[PDB]
Ligand binder design. Structure first.
Ligand code: HEM
Length: 294
């Protein structure tokens, strides 16, 4: 129906200190469960989870997004589009039990922020206030992007999330993290070498590696390199399109610029659909465990 408004409402009496504690719990668990996914750790899947939940947003009617924290996944994670995300939810369950006061949307988004920062990425300002909407669930059905498409598809798709060319290229840099798993999405292989360290490696690999279009064991095409890396058709489209290519080169040659742009685009992604009161607290910038000496 009519595009309802979602006003951020601070968890009763909570402030910076409370959220830094949740951040720390997530960060400590990331350090503890280091064996996950052949020692890649849960960092990447938490970032994917933050992106996926926020990526359901539609600027046209303000449905989906991170605010409600209530989703219905097609085939209950048994679909190529969402398979694997259950690992992120399982990881966050213990965190939510220790801090039952934090909303689901705040937890999912904070999980992504914490993961990026702990993996040495840029600081990502984060705002609290998302409110659970149990009577309003958002099916992920066809709301997230397909990986077997070209640049035109990518550009059009991201317009629904109100992201421009630079924002799209910056956000895609998160693929420096983790890997594709054949049993999950029908794609197999990591995008780079340091799977759990946030850097601009995604762009360097796109430009510097020798890519070959091959078919994986799920009969899907993907670009593979001799180094053992891979790129989805949508990732590779960033160097096939002349406008995207210019930006890829920019980030491949300026680590600081990429960090700054990613930080802005990621916060925007996590905040799409949310109306923050004029007197809402300012965004929080959490200290890493390293910065706290923990
Ligand atoms: C055209 C856009 C995108 C497409 C088609 C896409 C597709 C995929 C696919 C197929 C996987 C593999 C899932 C698996 O097999 O486990 C994946 C993983 C991942 N994606 Fe993307 N993605 C897109 C955008 C993004 C964005 C914007 C972010 C976040 C800023 C992101 C973060 C991640 C991360 C961190 C992983 C690794 C998860 C893990 O290792 O478990 N993706 N994505």
């Amino acid at each position: 129906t009519t595009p309802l408004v979602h006003v951020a409402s601070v968890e009763k009496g909570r402030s910076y200190e409370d959220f830094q504690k949740v951040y720390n719990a997530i960060a400590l668990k990331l350090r503890e469960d280091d064996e996950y996914d052949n020692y890649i750790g849960y960092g990447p899947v938490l970032v994917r989870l933050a992106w996926y939940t926020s990526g359901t947003w539609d600027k046209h009617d303000n449905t989906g997004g991170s605010y409600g924290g209530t989703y219905r996944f097609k085939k209950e994670f048994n679909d190529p589009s969402n398979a694997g995300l259950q690992n992120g939810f399982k990881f966050l369950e213990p965190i939510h039990k220790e801090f039952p006061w934090i909303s689901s949307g705040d937890l999912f988004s904070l999980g992504g922020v914490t993961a990026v920062q702990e993996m040495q990425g840029p600081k990502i300002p984060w705002r609290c206030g998302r409110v659970d909407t149990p009577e309003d669930t958002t099916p992920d059905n066809g709301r997230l992007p397909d990986a077997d498409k070209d640049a035109d598809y990518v550009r059009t798709f991201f317009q629904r999330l109100n992201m421009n060319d630079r924002e799209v290229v910056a956000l895609m840099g998160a693929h420096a993290l983790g890997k594709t798993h054949l049993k999950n999405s029908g794609y197999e292989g990591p995008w780079g070498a340091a799977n759990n360290v946030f850097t601009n490696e995604f762009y360097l690999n796109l430009l510097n590696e020798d890519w070959k279009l091959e078919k994986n064991d799920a009969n899907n095409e993907q670009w593979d390199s001799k180094s053992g890396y891979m790129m989805l058709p949508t990732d590779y489209s960033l160097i096939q399109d002349p406008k995207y290519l210019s930006i890829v080169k920019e980030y491949a040659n300026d680590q600081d610029k990429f960090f700054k742009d990613f930080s802005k685009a990621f916060e925007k992604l996590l905040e799409n659909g949310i109306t923050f009161p004029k007197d809402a607290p300012s965004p929080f910038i959490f200290k890493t465990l390293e910065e706290q000496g923990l």
